[PDB]
Structures are given as structure tokens and as C-alpha cells.
């Protein structure tokens, strides 16, 4: 039963689509997470001064 | 495979010691396999695979 359940779950996941999705997400964030967070803080300051 | 045993664990590792004929009331037993298999099967079986 456990093997059947794992097989049912694994047929749903497609390596091709999962691979391209994860590749896009990793290229999206690679080396820019700290920059993105600092930008969110900067935008917080900008909005606090603009509103 | 198996080969059970019983381990006496003391974090302090010092102080007073047990005397012959005494009893150790504090005990622990492993998590057991059958409940773990049941939990794994039930956790995986509720995921909606078509939604995945």
C-alpha cells in the first residue's frame, strides 16, 4: 500500500516541468535575495516618506 | 535487524549510586515501526495528486 501511494504521488510529478519551474525560480533569485530584502526595506522607507 | 538491549543513561554521571535490589522507575521505549508506517501511509494518502 505504501509503494502504491508513493507511485501514485510520483506519477503526478513530472521531472521536465518541475525541473524547468525550479530552474526559473533559481535563476530568478540567484545572488539577489539579500538585495531584494534590502530593496523592500528601502521601499518601506520611501513609502514612509511619501505617504 | 534487531538485537535489543537496555541502556542506563545519566546526564549528570555522578552523585549517589543505586544499591543492589533497587528499581529504576524512569524508562523510555523506542518509537516502534508499525505506527510509523501507518502514519506515513496516511500522510501520503491524503495529498491530492491530481491537484499536484
From TrEMBL, chain A:
Signal sequence residues: none
Name by which UniProt lists this protein: Virulence factor Mce family protein
Protein source organism: Mycolicibacterium smegmatis (strain ATCC 700084 / mc(2)155)
Lineage: Bacteria, Bacillati, Actinomycetota, Actinomycetes, Mycobacteriales
Whole-protein residues included: 155 to 205 of 409
Automatic annotation (TrEMBL), chain B:
Signal peptide range: none
Official protein name in the record: Mce-family protein mce1f
Organism lineage: Bacteria, Bacillati, Actinomycetota, Actinomycetes, Mycobacteriales
Amino acid at each position: 500500500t505504501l509503494f502504491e501511494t508513493i507511485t501514485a504521488i510520483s506519477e503526478q510529478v513530472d521531472p521536465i516541468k518541475l525541473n524547468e519551474t525550479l530552474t526559473a525560480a533559481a535563476q530568478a533569485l540567484d545572488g539577489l535575495g539579500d538585495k531584494f530584502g534590502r530593496s523592500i526595506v528601502d521601499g518601506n522607507a520611501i513609502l514612509a516618506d511619501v505617504n | 535487524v534487531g538485537e535489543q538491549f537496555i541502556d542506563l543513561t545519566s546526564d549528570s554521571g555522578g552523585g549517589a549510586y543505586f544499591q543492589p535490589g533497587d528499581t529504576i522507575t524512569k524508562a523510555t521505549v523506542p518509537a516502534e515501526v508499525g505506527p510509523a508506517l501507518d502514519a506515513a501511509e496516511k500522510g501520503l494518502a491524503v495529498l491530492p495528486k491530481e491537484k499536484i
